[PDB]
Amino acid sequence: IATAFAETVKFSGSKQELQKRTLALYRQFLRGAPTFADLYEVQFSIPTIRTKIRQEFERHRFVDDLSIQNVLYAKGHMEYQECINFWKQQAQFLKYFPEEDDIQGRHQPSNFVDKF
Amino acid sequence: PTDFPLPSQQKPNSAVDYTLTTLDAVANWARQGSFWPVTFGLACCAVEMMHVSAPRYDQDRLGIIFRASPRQSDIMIVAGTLTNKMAPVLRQVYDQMPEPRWVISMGSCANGGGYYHFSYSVVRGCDRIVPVDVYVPGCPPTSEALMYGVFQLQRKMRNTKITRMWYRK
Amino acid sequence: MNTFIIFIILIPIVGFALLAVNILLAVYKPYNEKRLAFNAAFILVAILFLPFDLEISTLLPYVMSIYLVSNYGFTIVLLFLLILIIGFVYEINTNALKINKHNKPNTDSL
Amino acid sequence: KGYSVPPGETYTAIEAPKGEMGVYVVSDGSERPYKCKIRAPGFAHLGAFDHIARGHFLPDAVAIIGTMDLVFGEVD
Amino acid sequence: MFIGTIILVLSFLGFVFNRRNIILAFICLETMLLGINLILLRNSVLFDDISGSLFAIVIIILAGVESAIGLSLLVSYYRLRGVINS
Amino acid sequence: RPDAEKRIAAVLESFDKISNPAAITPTASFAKDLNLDSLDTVEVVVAIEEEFGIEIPDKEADEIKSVNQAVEYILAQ
Amino acid sequence: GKTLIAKGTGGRSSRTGYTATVFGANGFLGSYLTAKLAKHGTTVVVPYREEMAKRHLKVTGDLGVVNFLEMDLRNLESIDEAVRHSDIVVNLIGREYETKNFNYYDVHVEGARRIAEAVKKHNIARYIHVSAFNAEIDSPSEFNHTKGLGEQVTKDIVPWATIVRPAPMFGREDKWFLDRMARSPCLVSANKFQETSNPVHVIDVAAALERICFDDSTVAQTFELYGPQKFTQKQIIDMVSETLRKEVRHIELPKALYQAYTKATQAIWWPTYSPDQVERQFLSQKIDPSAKTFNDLDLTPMELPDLMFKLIRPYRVN
Amino acid sequence: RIRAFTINFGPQHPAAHGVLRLILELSGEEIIRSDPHVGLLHRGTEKLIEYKTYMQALPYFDRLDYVSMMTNEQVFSL
Amino acid sequence: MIINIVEILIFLVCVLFSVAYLTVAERKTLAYMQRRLGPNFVGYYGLLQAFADAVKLLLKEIVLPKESNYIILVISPLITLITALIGWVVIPLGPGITLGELNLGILFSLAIGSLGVFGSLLSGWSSNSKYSLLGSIRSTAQLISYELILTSIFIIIIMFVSSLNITTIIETQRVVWYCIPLLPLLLIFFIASVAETARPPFDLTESESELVAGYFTEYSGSPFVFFFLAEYSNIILISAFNGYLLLGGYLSFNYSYLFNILFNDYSYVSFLFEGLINSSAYAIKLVFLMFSFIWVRAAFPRFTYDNLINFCWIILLPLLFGIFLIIPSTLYIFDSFPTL
Ligand SMILES: CCCCCCCCCCCCCCCCCC(=O)OC[C@H](COP(=O)(O)OCCN)OC(=O)CCCCCCCCCCCCCCCCC
Ligand SMILES: NC(=O)C1=CN([C@@H]2O[C@H](COP(=O)(O)OP(=O)(O)OC[C@H]3O[C@@H](n4cnc5c(N)ncnc54)[C@H](OP(=O)(O)O)[C@@H]3O)[C@@H](O)[C@H]2O)C=CC1
Ligand code: SF4
């Protein structure tokens, strides 16, 4: 009998309509980025948020089936729902951000020789 | 300068201490006497914790009068199992807590993960989160057990030797 | 001097004393991690608090010298309390919060 | 090896003192249960809480938690 | 009567040069009504028993209702309790 | 209108992936003229609304394809 | 000591077998290096002196990777016991002030000589000794004089002496680099009110010490950990006061008039601002021309200001 | 129109025997919208007894509802 | 000059040592009332817990980046100075004939009990938390609304007095045991007295973890012992203030001491004894009063703010205005008015 930020679940049929719907989702998910940086007090900048959001949607550019893209849309809008307020905490929130290199030391240079 | 008198000294163990054992034991007795926690109280082990507030094994015969506020607290009894979801809230509670702080891990689940320990959503012991000074074993440990851990913590407090550690013993 | 001025002067210094004991020897090392809304009954209570204080301030000299005004100060203050109590019978009719959401209407069909 | 359990489904509810507890068990026909789903009044009454709590104050809500037996070790 | 005129004048030209914070102006206008009583009370003390101090207890009882109407009117300097606006 | 699109051709120029600002004719396309992604189209739309401190509805974000449309909606305040 | 493939693994409790011992480590720098050291499965003997301060180093690893021993630099036997079983040993040690029981001598010279004698008596590979920036043999900051003597003693015996000279450090709870910026009731010193030098971030110091403490082919080299770019002066105070409060309030007092507070400092319960710090305010980074740095051990330490944005941000106005 | 704010009700000790994280929104200190938030304690018994035997299952099973223990034992046993 | 400073040190150590052991006293009597035993372990007998707890909780001292220290480092000292201690400036029947107070008693106590309220309000003003300061405004609103019907009833009981200096009430009340025997609105004074110094069955702004795991601010350290000591000291002061006017000092055995001291002493041997039994009388009238506070702590639960303002501005106050529509009336009827 309520919402929190108007999460709706109704998957359309046509892939064009799903395209437009994910597009508007991307706009809200991008617009909330200074609200995110306010809310969680990250070290990095707002353009780091924006390039990583763009990275996350380019992870699923070439997914064929609209009947997979439905639940991908639900995951996207739902994690927008859990990010637009303070359900997620910053320790929960840094699981998207492999930010620093110096945690690792010297490591694998993706050569076979240094697997050994 | 450039020379050194300082010889091979004892361990932190002494008896010749003028006035510092007395003053330190007074302050340590004050800290050892009142001793209130804040409840964090997550599960069944909190039911035994509130059984220590029951009249059979009363807290207030010792001084344990817990407030519901992490600044007014001294020690932070983690009881119940500890989810993956909880643990940042627990460490944030732990940080807003004044510097003479200790942690009691009440309950087997609270230390080394306990009876679940093999969940995706449980933390394998609060040693992954907060530093702990007294463990308390077993699913739900007895009210006897929690008070025995409390007296062992106070027995640890009786060896804190903080004032003569300012004197660098 | 010498009577209670000592008390109202000693006491602020005792307050600063028990304050300024532990400002030095408590360990600080502060690590980290350390518009609005309304109602009418949250405001009008304290607004209407004030006149009913200072009518008691009005009443206080009368109750100081209740004597030297006999048979007549009684009449005047009875008129004063009548004029005030009608203000009370104004304000009894309205001041309460109202639960906004509780509906009951009967259901109809075609 | 535990023991043999015949296959199939069942569901069984008794009134625990917090409400109807249901246990829904799909047994494989083997040593170990292929599915167990609990059903908790502390997971349903908590679900109803928003529909009940509207039009109150916060110290109303503190009492109305305790009325419907919200001990959250019976959530999942 | 230096003691009351000085606080009255400073409250007054504080109420003039008040290009910040409407409520500081409002309380300077309040403190005028106790800058005036330090004039009135010491004139009554230099004179007599209750002639001007009756007016003093009047202006105290009425300065209460001054601040009461001023608050309960400042609440309505806007919309009421709170809504969308601009 | 005047020098609003100065600010817009400053923001889009400050935005990357457009190596030729001489290719930015003002009254020109986004995805035809500069090969902007449909994702990147509304990305720079949100960049534009964030620069002017203004908030747009959904259909106003739907209709924008060239910046003359954008300036024409900028004109609404 | 011989090992397997490299340092950086991909999972905790995939344990190494390297048995390290870190002196000090209750306070400032020794947090983050044992945080990097127990993160990747190494046994750490961390000795201590105060029981209530050693606790928050336990949660870095789970089991057997943190241990407590009751050392004291007076006691030979305690340090003797402390590194019987060790494999590598670092000592970050040395207060920035004398105690009521310690000279500046024999907190990193004969205090260093005892533990290095224990190293030579135990044949411990990979002894690493930190020492201060600007570690001369000249007088003017007898702190620096004593660190130069300490480096001399650690090179007298034990050619296994990787000496590392970090710059003024920069991290959370900076002892006298940002606590005198953050709390800063009236930061007032520096007769020469500018003219300091290189800052280095603390997790970069810890990464440098981590990437030195495991690889070989670096025995007896000395390192200096330079600031990345800026080598900047007290004008960074202005960047510190780029945060809106600007409460920094440097009042640039005379030199000999400033001594009295430092001579007050010996009487106090807690340490404040002892005069070798005041003398180091007249110094700068006497940068070694020949000492290997982050570029030698393949690191790039982070810059000052953008990291300072994260590092001081509880302390804003609104 | 309505411009309402929100609070978090209990991190640790609001109601005893409950980690009652309740994200609760108020206009006039009226609970116009209520969003209980539970699930902090998802210890995952529902997964765990899929790999345990039936004799092993029961001391998982009264860890749910820890104030009515052997009744929960009894409903599983029935 | 030397006698009065050692006087004031004796009286301060009495009140301070008093309010120290009062918290142990109430915890013991709650515990026996809760069918258990209180602090029974501390040191030498078990009378000592608060006297060690004070030394305990000094040594904590946190500050908060959401708030200026300059207000919260002083605002619990404010109510420690004014609300707790200089309410005793009136020497609320310093239980002999004599006091440490010159005159003009009751409205000084009124003024300082009035002065404590924004000590509570500015305390709750802190930290700029949008869920906190509304709770502060709640606390202060109910606090002033029961201040008003302390005020408007102890100004009407002095209508049987008309003299405003402190003692004249007490010498007036020894004839009738005037305090409660002529009027039982003591009880509503008592139920007013739990609110204006909230150690109550109301507990109202102590929504301890209903807010974000903190109730007032959690200003722990020396401000905590300041707030704690000042709340308990406000309790024993307002309890004395009840035992001052509307409960009686000077128990009737001192009125009968005409039939006792004339059978005990010859002629004025340094006034050795009568101040002691008079103090005994006032002390047993005071601790027996606050024993009912420690009852009502553990008898009836919290009291629901909207109903609390219902309980102020709808019921008690019109009954009150009736009750001083009759106490001016009835003495005017029956015989006459009091002089001063
Ligand atoms: C006639 C000849 C004499 C003439 C002089 C007359 C003087 C008489 C003395 C004063 C008269 C006493 C008046 C008492 C006022 C109390 C009235 C009252 O409490 O009303 C109840 C009211 C109930 O709430 P509500 O729901 O709004 O009521 C509507 C129901 N349809 O409100 C409530 O919610 C109840 C809350 C009450 C809280 C009380 C808490 C416990 C107090 C008990 C401790 C006192 C015991 C110690 C003192 C006793 C000493 C003997
Ligand atoms: N301005 C600076 O501080 C700079 C630091 N350095 C070097 O980095 C090293 C580590 O820095 P930092 O992390 O801040 O050091 P710490 O402030 O953390 O202190 C070092 C630890 O070792 C303890 N310790 C060891 N031996 C003694 C002893 N004889 N007497 C008293 N205490 C002793 C200290 O006290 P306890 O015994 O109580 O545990 C302390 O806990 C420093 O020694 C310094 O030489 C270099 C550049 C700049
Ligand atoms: S330790 Fe035992 S009693 Fe506590 S929550 Fe875990 S299973 Fe329950």
mmCIF file of all heavy atoms in Angstrom, chain B residues 168, chain G residues 24 26-30 49 73 92-96 102 107 130 132-133 147 166-169 175, ligand 2:
data_model
loop_
_atom_site.group_PDB
_atom_site.id
_atom_site.type_symbol
_atom_site.label_atom_id
_atom_site.label_comp_id
_atom_site.label_asym_id
_atom_site.label_seq_id
_atom_site.Cartn_x
_atom_site.Cartn_y
_atom_site.Cartn_z
ATOM 1 N N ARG B 168 56.153 3.942 32.583
ATOM 2 C CA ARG B 168 56.920 3.079 31.682
ATOM 3 C C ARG B 168 57.591 1.928 32.429
ATOM 4 O O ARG B 168 58.811 1.779 32.451
ATOM 5 C CB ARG B 168 57.923 3.879 30.845
ATOM 6 C CG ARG B 168 57.240 4.821 29.885
ATOM 7 C CD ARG B 168 56.388 3.990 28.957
ATOM 8 N NE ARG B 168 55.753 4.733 27.882
ATOM 9 C CZ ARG B 168 54.843 4.191 27.084
ATOM 10 N NH1 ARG B 168 54.472 2.935 27.284
ATOM 11 N NH2 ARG B 168 54.291 4.896 26.108
ATOM 12 N N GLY G 24 57.309 -1.330 17.736
ATOM 13 C CA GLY G 24 56.378 -0.236 17.874
ATOM 14 C C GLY G 24 54.976 -0.666 17.522
ATOM 15 O O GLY G 24 54.327 -1.381 18.290
ATOM 16 N N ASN G 26 51.999 0.010 17.650
ATOM 17 C CA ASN G 26 50.757 0.357 18.321
ATOM 18 C C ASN G 26 50.220 1.663 17.785
ATOM 19 O O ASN G 26 49.007 1.835 17.635
ATOM 20 C CB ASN G 26 50.979 0.466 19.822
ATOM 21 C CG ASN G 26 51.192 -0.869 20.467
ATOM 22 O OD1 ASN G 26 50.493 -1.833 20.162
ATOM 23 N ND2 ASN G 26 52.163 -0.941 21.367
ATOM 24 N N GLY G 27 51.113 2.585 17.479
ATOM 25 C CA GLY G 27 50.703 3.895 17.056
ATOM 26 C C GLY G 27 50.571 4.010 15.559
ATOM 27 O O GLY G 27 49.900 3.202 14.916
ATOM 28 N N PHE G 28 51.257 4.992 14.990
ATOM 29 C CA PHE G 28 50.749 5.610 13.779
ATOM 30 C C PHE G 28 51.093 4.835 12.518
ATOM 31 O O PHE G 28 50.198 4.394 11.794
ATOM 32 C CB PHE G 28 51.262 7.032 13.684
ATOM 33 C CG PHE G 28 50.823 7.711 12.471
ATOM 34 C CD1 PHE G 28 49.491 7.977 12.287
ATOM 35 C CD2 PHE G 28 51.727 8.097 11.518
ATOM 36 C CE1 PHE G 28 49.069 8.603 11.168
ATOM 37 C CE2 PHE G 28 51.301 8.734 10.401
ATOM 38 C CZ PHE G 28 49.962 8.983 10.234
ATOM 39 N N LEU G 29 52.378 4.697 12.213
ATOM 40 C CA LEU G 29 52.738 4.066 10.951
ATOM 41 C C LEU G 29 52.518 2.566 11.012
ATOM 42 O O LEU G 29 52.040 1.958 10.047
ATOM 43 C CB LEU G 29 54.185 4.378 10.594
ATOM 44 C CG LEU G 29 54.559 3.837 9.218
ATOM 45 C CD1 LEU G 29 53.690 4.488 8.170
ATOM 46 C CD2 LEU G 29 56.012 4.063 8.913
ATOM 47 N N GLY G 30 52.793 1.968 12.157
ATOM 48 C CA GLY G 30 52.713 0.537 12.282
ATOM 49 C C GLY G 30 51.327 -0.043 12.260
ATOM 50 O O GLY G 30 51.201 -1.268 12.279
ATOM 51 N N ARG G 49 53.837 -2.275 24.520
ATOM 52 C CA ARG G 49 54.195 -1.849 25.857
ATOM 53 C C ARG G 49 52.954 -1.524 26.678
ATOM 54 O O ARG G 49 52.965 -1.650 27.905
ATOM 55 C CB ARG G 49 55.132 -0.654 25.773
ATOM 56 C CG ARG G 49 55.863 -0.397 27.046
ATOM 57 C CD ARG G 49 56.919 0.626 26.810
ATOM 58 N NE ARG G 49 57.784 0.197 25.722
ATOM 59 C CZ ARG G 49 58.837 0.879 25.305
ATOM 60 N NH1 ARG G 49 59.176 1.984 25.938
ATOM 61 N NH2 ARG G 49 59.573 0.429 24.301
ATOM 62 N N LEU G 73 62.624 -2.048 25.678
ATOM 63 C CA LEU G 73 63.991 -1.818 25.220
ATOM 64 C C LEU G 73 65.013 -1.792 26.340
ATOM 65 O O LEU G 73 66.207 -1.927 26.065
ATOM 66 C CB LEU G 73 64.079 -0.510 24.449
ATOM 67 C CG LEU G 73 63.454 -0.555 23.067
ATOM 68 C CD1 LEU G 73 63.487 0.814 22.439
ATOM 69 C CD2 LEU G 73 64.231 -1.535 22.230
ATOM 70 N N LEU G 92 60.005 0.274 13.223
ATOM 71 C CA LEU G 92 59.641 1.659 13.403
ATOM 72 C C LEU G 92 59.582 1.898 14.899
ATOM 73 O O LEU G 92 58.905 1.169 15.626
ATOM 74 C CB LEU G 92 58.334 2.001 12.701
ATOM 75 C CG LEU G 92 57.026 1.250 12.895
ATOM 76 C CD1 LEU G 92 56.182 1.759 14.042
ATOM 77 C CD2 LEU G 92 56.286 1.463 11.636
ATOM 78 N N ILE G 93 60.367 2.863 15.361
ATOM 79 C CA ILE G 93 60.532 3.136 16.779
ATOM 80 C C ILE G 93 60.885 4.601 16.941
ATOM 81 O O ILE G 93 61.253 5.284 15.986
ATOM 82 C CB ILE G 93 61.603 2.220 17.427
ATOM 83 C CG1 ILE G 93 62.700 1.854 16.425
ATOM 84 C CG2 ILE G 93 60.991 1.000 18.076
ATOM 85 C CD1 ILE G 93 63.832 2.809 16.353
ATOM 86 N N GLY G 94 60.756 5.089 18.165
ATOM 87 C CA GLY G 94 61.219 6.425 18.464
ATOM 88 C C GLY G 94 60.115 7.446 18.591
ATOM 89 O O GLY G 94 59.444 7.779 17.612
ATOM 90 N N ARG G 95 59.921 7.947 19.805
ATOM 91 C CA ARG G 95 59.030 9.070 20.005
ATOM 92 C C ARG G 95 59.640 10.333 19.416
ATOM 93 O O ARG G 95 60.847 10.427 19.182
ATOM 94 C CB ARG G 95 58.741 9.268 21.489
ATOM 95 C CG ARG G 95 57.976 8.129 22.104
ATOM 96 C CD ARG G 95 56.600 8.083 21.499
ATOM 97 N NE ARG G 95 55.741 7.078 22.107
ATOM 98 C CZ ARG G 95 54.508 6.812 21.691
ATOM 99 N NH1 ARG G 95 54.002 7.464 20.652
ATOM 100 N NH2 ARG G 95 53.789 5.874 22.295
ATOM 101 N N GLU G 96 58.783 11.322 19.179
ATOM 102 C CA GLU G 96 59.206 12.626 18.691
ATOM 103 C C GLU G 96 59.480 13.595 19.851
ATOM 104 O O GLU G 96 59.403 14.821 19.703
ATOM 105 C CB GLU G 96 58.143 13.141 17.711
ATOM 106 C CG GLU G 96 58.561 14.249 16.753
ATOM 107 C CD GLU G 96 57.507 14.584 15.711
ATOM 108 O OE1 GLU G 96 56.492 13.866 15.627
ATOM 109 O OE2 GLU G 96 57.687 15.587 14.988
ATOM 110 N N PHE G 102 63.384 8.504 29.183
ATOM 111 C CA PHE G 102 64.193 8.217 28.011
ATOM 112 C C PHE G 102 64.876 9.472 27.499
ATOM 113 O O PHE G 102 64.278 10.550 27.463
ATOM 114 C CB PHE G 102 63.364 7.622 26.887
ATOM 115 C CG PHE G 102 62.952 6.212 27.123
ATOM 116 C CD1 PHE G 102 61.660 5.907 27.498
ATOM 117 C CD2 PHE G 102 63.856 5.182 26.939
ATOM 118 C CE1 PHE G 102 61.280 4.596 27.704
ATOM 119 C CE2 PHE G 102 63.484 3.870 27.147
ATOM 120 C CZ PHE G 102 62.194 3.577 27.529
ATOM 121 N N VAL G 107 66.784 5.704 22.283
ATOM 122 C CA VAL G 107 65.488 5.273 21.781
ATOM 123 C C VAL G 107 65.544 4.921 20.315
ATOM 124 O O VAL G 107 64.605 4.288 19.810
ATOM 125 C CB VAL G 107 64.381 6.316 22.032
ATOM 126 C CG1 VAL G 107 64.183 6.535 23.505
ATOM 127 C CG2 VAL G 107 64.695 7.601 21.344
ATOM 128 N N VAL G 130 63.668 1.882 9.920
ATOM 129 C CA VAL G 130 63.257 3.198 9.475
ATOM 130 C C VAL G 130 64.104 4.236 10.194
ATOM 131 O O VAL G 130 64.659 3.996 11.268
ATOM 132 C CB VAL G 130 61.756 3.463 9.691
ATOM 133 C CG1 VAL G 130 60.928 2.284 9.236
ATOM 134 C CG2 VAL G 130 61.448 3.868 11.111
ATOM 135 N N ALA G 132 64.596 8.888 10.271
ATOM 136 C CA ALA G 132 63.904 10.104 9.913
ATOM 137 C C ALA G 132 64.429 10.667 8.606
ATOM 138 O O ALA G 132 65.526 10.345 8.145
ATOM 139 C CB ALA G 132 64.050 11.151 11.009
ATOM 140 N N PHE G 133 63.598 11.501 7.998
ATOM 141 C CA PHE G 133 64.058 12.426 6.982
ATOM 142 C C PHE G 133 65.107 13.345 7.582
ATOM 143 O O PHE G 133 65.099 13.612 8.789
ATOM 144 C CB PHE G 133 62.887 13.251 6.455
ATOM 145 C CG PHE G 133 62.301 14.201 7.467
ATOM 146 C CD1 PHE G 133 62.643 15.546 7.465
ATOM 147 C CD2 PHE G 133 61.371 13.759 8.389
ATOM 148 C CE1 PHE G 133 62.104 16.411 8.389
ATOM 149 C CE2 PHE G 133 60.830 14.621 9.313
ATOM 150 C CZ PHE G 133 61.195 15.949 9.312
ATOM 151 N N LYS G 147 69.092 10.230 14.896
ATOM 152 C CA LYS G 147 68.732 9.302 13.828
ATOM 153 C C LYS G 147 69.929 9.015 12.934
ATOM 154 O O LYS G 147 70.088 7.892 12.439
ATOM 155 C CB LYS G 147 67.581 9.850 12.988
ATOM 156 C CG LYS G 147 66.312 10.186 13.751
ATOM 157 C CD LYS G 147 65.649 9.013 14.438
ATOM 158 C CE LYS G 147 64.892 8.125 13.501
ATOM 159 N NZ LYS G 147 64.171 7.073 14.252
ATOM 160 N N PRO G 166 61.639 7.886 5.375
ATOM 161 C CA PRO G 166 60.432 8.540 4.876
ATOM 162 C C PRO G 166 60.446 10.030 5.157
ATOM 163 O O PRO G 166 61.158 10.528 6.027
ATOM 164 C CB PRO G 166 59.312 7.850 5.654
ATOM 165 C CG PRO G 166 59.965 7.370 6.886
ATOM 166 C CD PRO G 166 61.340 6.967 6.480
ATOM 167 N N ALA G 167 59.619 10.733 4.408
ATOM 168 C CA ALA G 167 59.418 12.166 4.556
ATOM 169 C C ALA G 167 58.436 12.397 5.705
ATOM 170 O O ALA G 167 58.023 11.445 6.373
ATOM 171 C CB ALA G 167 58.950 12.725 3.215
ATOM 172 N N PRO G 168 58.091 13.651 6.022
ATOM 173 C CA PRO G 168 56.891 13.882 6.838
ATOM 174 C C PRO G 168 55.649 13.244 6.235
ATOM 175 O O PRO G 168 55.347 13.415 5.051
ATOM 176 C CB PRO G 168 56.788 15.404 6.874
ATOM 177 C CG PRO G 168 58.186 15.828 6.866
ATOM 178 C CD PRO G 168 58.927 14.872 5.994
ATOM 179 N N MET G 169 54.942 12.486 7.063
ATOM 180 C CA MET G 169 53.891 11.592 6.610
ATOM 181 C C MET G 169 52.522 12.252 6.694
ATOM 182 O O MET G 169 52.349 13.339 7.246
ATOM 183 C CB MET G 169 53.914 10.300 7.416
ATOM 184 C CG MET G 169 55.137 9.484 7.144
ATOM 185 S SD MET G 169 55.080 7.928 8.015
ATOM 186 C CE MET G 169 55.325 8.522 9.677
ATOM 187 N N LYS G 175 50.091 12.274 13.557
ATOM 188 C CA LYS G 175 50.783 12.884 14.677
ATOM 189 C C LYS G 175 51.682 13.990 14.151
ATOM 190 O O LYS G 175 52.697 13.721 13.498
ATOM 191 C CB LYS G 175 51.563 11.838 15.460
ATOM 192 C CG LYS G 175 50.676 10.948 16.286
ATOM 193 C CD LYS G 175 51.494 10.069 17.196
ATOM 194 C CE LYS G 175 50.590 9.188 18.016
ATOM 195 N NZ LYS G 175 49.763 10.015 18.927
HETATM 196 N N1 LIG J 2 57.323 13.591 12.291
HETATM 197 C C1 LIG J 2 57.238 12.138 12.326
HETATM 198 O O1 LIG J 2 56.656 11.612 13.212
HETATM 199 C C2 LIG J 2 57.897 11.258 11.243
HETATM 200 C C3 LIG J 2 58.103 9.802 11.522
HETATM 201 N N2 LIG J 2 59.256 9.149 11.040
HETATM 202 C C4 LIG J 2 59.723 7.958 11.682
HETATM 203 O O2 LIG J 2 58.508 6.911 11.633
HETATM 204 C C5 LIG J 2 58.629 6.207 12.707
HETATM 205 C C6 LIG J 2 57.203 5.776 13.118
HETATM 206 O O3 LIG J 2 56.413 6.934 13.079
HETATM 207 P P1 LIG J 2 55.109 6.816 14.085
HETATM 208 O O4 LIG J 2 54.216 5.725 13.546
HETATM 209 O O5 LIG J 2 54.371 8.122 14.208
HETATM 210 O O6 LIG J 2 55.683 6.364 15.553
HETATM 211 P P2 LIG J 2 54.622 6.175 16.800
HETATM 212 O O7 LIG J 2 54.010 7.514 17.136
HETATM 213 O O8 LIG J 2 53.563 5.226 16.325
HETATM 214 O O9 LIG J 2 55.430 5.540 18.100
HETATM 215 C C7 LIG J 2 56.233 4.408 17.859
HETATM 216 C C8 LIG J 2 55.772 3.289 18.825
HETATM 217 O O10 LIG J 2 56.808 2.679 19.340
HETATM 218 C C9 LIG J 2 56.726 2.803 20.946
HETATM 219 N N3 LIG J 2 58.122 2.672 21.388
HETATM 220 C C10 LIG J 2 59.132 1.943 20.922
HETATM 221 N N4 LIG J 2 60.218 2.147 21.663
HETATM 222 C C11 LIG J 2 59.887 3.023 22.607
HETATM 223 C C12 LIG J 2 60.644 3.559 23.625
HETATM 224 N N5 LIG J 2 62.038 3.422 24.070
HETATM 225 N N6 LIG J 2 60.136 4.418 24.480
HETATM 226 C C13 LIG J 2 58.840 4.774 24.361
HETATM 227 N N7 LIG J 2 58.102 4.235 23.368
HETATM 228 C C14 LIG J 2 58.600 3.355 22.470
HETATM 229 C C15 LIG J 2 56.106 3.930 21.112
HETATM 230 O O11 LIG J 2 55.378 3.987 22.409
HETATM 231 P P3 LIG J 2 54.947 2.667 23.272
HETATM 232 O O12 LIG J 2 56.151 2.012 23.903
HETATM 233 O O13 LIG J 2 54.000 3.154 24.335
HETATM 234 O O14 LIG J 2 54.211 1.706 22.377
HETATM 235 C C16 LIG J 2 55.062 3.972 19.984
HETATM 236 O O15 LIG J 2 53.947 3.272 20.311
HETATM 237 C C17 LIG J 2 59.146 7.196 13.747
HETATM 238 O O16 LIG J 2 59.923 6.555 14.652
HETATM 239 C C18 LIG J 2 59.995 8.188 12.927
HETATM 240 O O17 LIG J 2 61.444 7.913 13.169
HETATM 241 C C19 LIG J 2 59.947 9.656 9.898
HETATM 242 C C20 LIG J 2 59.411 10.918 9.184
HETATM 243 C C21 LIG J 2 58.355 11.840 9.893
#
